[PDB]
Design a protein around this ligand. Structure first.
Ligand SMILES: C[C@H](CCC(=O)NCCC[N+](C)(C)CCCS(=O)(=O)[O-])[C@H]1CC[C@H]2[C@@H]3[C@H](O)C[C@@H]4C[C@H](O)CC[C@]4(C)[C@H]3C[C@H](O)[C@]12C
Ligand SMILES: C[C@H](CCC(=O)NCCC[N+](C)(C)CCCS(=O)(=O)[O-])[C@H]1CC[C@H]2[C@@H]3[C@H](O)C[C@@H]4C[C@H](O)CC[C@]4(C)[C@H]3C[C@H](O)[C@]12C
Ligand SMILES: C[C@H](CCC(=O)NCCC[N+](C)(C)CCCS(=O)(=O)[O-])[C@H]1CC[C@H]2[C@@H]3[C@H](O)C[C@@H]4C[C@H](O)CC[C@]4(C)[C@H]3C[C@H](O)[C@]12C
Ligand SMILES: C[C@H](CCC(=O)NCCC[N+](C)(C)CCCS(=O)(=O)[O-])[C@H]1CC[C@H]2[C@@H]3[C@H](O)C[C@@H]4C[C@H](O)CC[C@]4(C)[C@H]3C[C@H](O)[C@]12C
Ligand SMILES: C[C@H](CCC(=O)NCCC[N+](C)(C)CCCS(=O)(=O)[O-])[C@H]1CC[C@H]2[C@@H]3[C@H](O)C[C@@H]4C[C@H](O)CC[C@]4(C)[C@H]3C[C@H](O)[C@]12C
Ligand SMILES: C[S@@+](CC[C@H](N)C(=O)[O-])C[C@H]1O[C@@H](n2cnc3c(N)ncnc32)[C@H](O)[C@@H]1O
Ligand code: SF4
Ligand code: FES
Ligand SMILES: [Cl-]
Ligand SMILES: [Cl-]
Ligand SMILES: [S]
Ligand SMILES: [S]
Length: 346
């Protein structure tokens, strides 16, 4: 029964059986209780601070051909761009001026910068007294080492799907094995490390989602980024169904319940498939938000999926917008860099 699954979740009985049932039950009352539980756990372990990570999507050049992604190399129906290192550093500075305490640098897997240009940029941004998070994809261990030495604090490398067969089909250049090795390497080098998956991928099952939850729990990641699959018309998956918002929200809720002291964003994809989706997600276990800080004319060209929010807004709109969001939610902005604050328990 729903009540019994909740009781088992409250007792930390995180068995594969309990998780599958949580994700399988479609009862409104159960879902609402699950969301309330995650919301409460969030409040108790990580408080009311919502940490703002200003994201600069500095290049849409990619060497990989992931079947879901609008930046995949086979997509010829996309103007490619690269911000200069000077543009990136000064764009970060403007975010810092606007109060950002973390700068996230995200890109396609664009060889041009790797590794030295990134290292240079990271060094300049670290001078500003903020955290630096990288989200640049899979690279050799030596690049990750150089970036850590340059002062990067965190690395986001969503695991996408913990089903290796699905993973290899959707990401034909690589493998789940590679992805995991990258994540373990990032952990070994001392990064705060972020994983996470998409929900509603073509061919992905509820059991797969359970496996994603158990994977996250096993590796105790510092951040977990979860969003629905959103089909992109210039990709092989154009005609596939989008991920379900409620199911994805349950995955966020259960991630909070499983990893109570983790950092969990309300992802842009959540706000894209449902108006006000991020705000809902922040009330169901999330404690991080990532306003778009990519400038025009480039912001509109970073089209991982269609309809992306923030694209029509002015260059500087998104930080103020999320500060308003945080206040209207009755929440507080992050005071510090919002690094993981581990609560050791049993
Ligand atoms: C209480 C007042 C009257 C009615 C009018 C519109 C209703 C909401 C909407 O229907 C959308 C949504 C449907 C879900 O099913 C349950 C949640 C939610 C937010 C509803 C809650 C509630 O019922 C509302 C506020
Ligand atoms: C605001 C609306 C409508 C309330 C209403 O209006 N009904 C009374 C006198 S009266 O005359 O109105 O009947 C209520 C109805 C159900 C509520 C959500 C669920 O709980 C699940 C979840 C629990 C988390 O913790 C916080 C987030 C979330 C998404 C909740 C948000 C919000 O809270 C909702 C949408
Ligand atoms: C950038 C310009 C020009 C002056 C400037 O260059 N100001 C640097 C400030 C640096 N900070 C104090 C934010 C660093 C905090 C990091 S610290 O480590 O100290 O915690 C200044 C002038 C007025 C400032 C806005 C208003 O105030 C209202 C609002 C307050 C929020 O709060 C942050 C958002 C917002 C929109 C502000 C953003 C920005 O700021 C503005 C535009
Ligand atoms: C109104 C829109 C449709 C556009 C639909 C699409 C997804 C729906 C929410 C999710 O289902 C999660 C959650 C379940 C609770 O039961 C009631 C509250 C909440 C937040 C739902 C409210 C509402 O119904 C939403 C926003
Ligand atoms: C300048 C824009 C308009 C408004 C909208 C919401 C306002 C923030 C919130 O009020 C919370 C808090 C007080 C301080 C802080 C963060 C405010 C800064 C500024 O005043 C904001 C960003
Ligand atoms: C666009 S990549 C950029 C960073 C780096 N290239 C990488 O792959 O990790 C960032 C994330 O976007 C998400 N993403 C890509 N295409 C998506 C889609 N169609 N719908 C939802 N999320 C998508 C993936 O989960 C991916 O980890
Ligand atoms: S998900 Fe990352 S690696 Fe894959 S095509 Fe998109 S930008 Fe490139
Ligand atoms: S950050 Fe909320 S719409 Fe851009
Ligand atoms: Cl971060
Ligand atoms: Cl996203
Ligand atoms: S925005
Ligand atoms: S926002």
């Amino acid at each position: 029964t729903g009540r019994e699954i909740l009781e088992k979740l409250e007792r930390r009985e995180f068995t594969r059986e309990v998780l599958k049932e949580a994700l399988s039950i479609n009862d409104r009352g159960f879902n609402e209780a699950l969301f309330k539980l995650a919301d409460e756990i969030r409040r108790k372990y990580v408080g009311d601070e919502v940490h703002i990570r200003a994201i600069i999507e500095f290049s849409n050049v990619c060497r990989k051909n992931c079947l879901y992604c609008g930046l995949r190399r086979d997509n010829k129906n996309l103007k490619r761009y690269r911000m200069t290192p000077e543009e990136i550093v000064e764009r970060a500075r403007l975010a810092v001026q606007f109060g950002a305490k973390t700068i996230v640098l995200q890109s396609g897997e664009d060889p041009y910068x790797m590794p030295d240009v990134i290292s240079d940029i990271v060094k300049e941004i670290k001078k500003m007294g903020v955290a630096v998070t990288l989200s640049l994809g899979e690279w050799p261990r030596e690049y990750y080492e150089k970036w850590k030495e340059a002062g990067a604090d965190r690395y986001l490398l969503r695991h996408e799907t913990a089903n290796p067969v699905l993973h290899r089909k959707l990401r034909p250049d690589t493998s789940f094995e590679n992805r995991l090795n990258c994540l373990l390497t990032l952990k070994e080098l001392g990064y705060e490390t972020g994983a996470g998956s998409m929900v509603g991928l073509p061919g992905q099952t509820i059991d797969d989602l359970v496996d994603d939850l158990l994977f996250l729990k096993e590796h105790d990641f510092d951040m977990v980024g979860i969003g629905p699959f959103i089909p992109h018309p210039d990709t092989p998956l154009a005609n596939e169904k989008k991920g379900d918002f409620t199911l994805t929200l349950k995955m966020v809720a259960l991630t909070r319940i499983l990893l109570p002291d983790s950092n969990i964003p309300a992802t842009t994809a959540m706000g894209t498939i449902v108006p006000g989706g991020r705000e809902i997600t922040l009330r169901c276990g999330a404690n991080v938000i990532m306003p778009n800080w990519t400038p025009s004319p480039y912001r509109q060209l970073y089209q991982l999926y269609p309809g992306k929010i923030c694209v029509f807004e002015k260059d500087t709109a998104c930080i103020p917008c999320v500060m308003k969001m945080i206040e209207l939610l009755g929440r507080k902005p992050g005071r510090d860099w919002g690094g993981r604050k581990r609560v050791f328990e049993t």
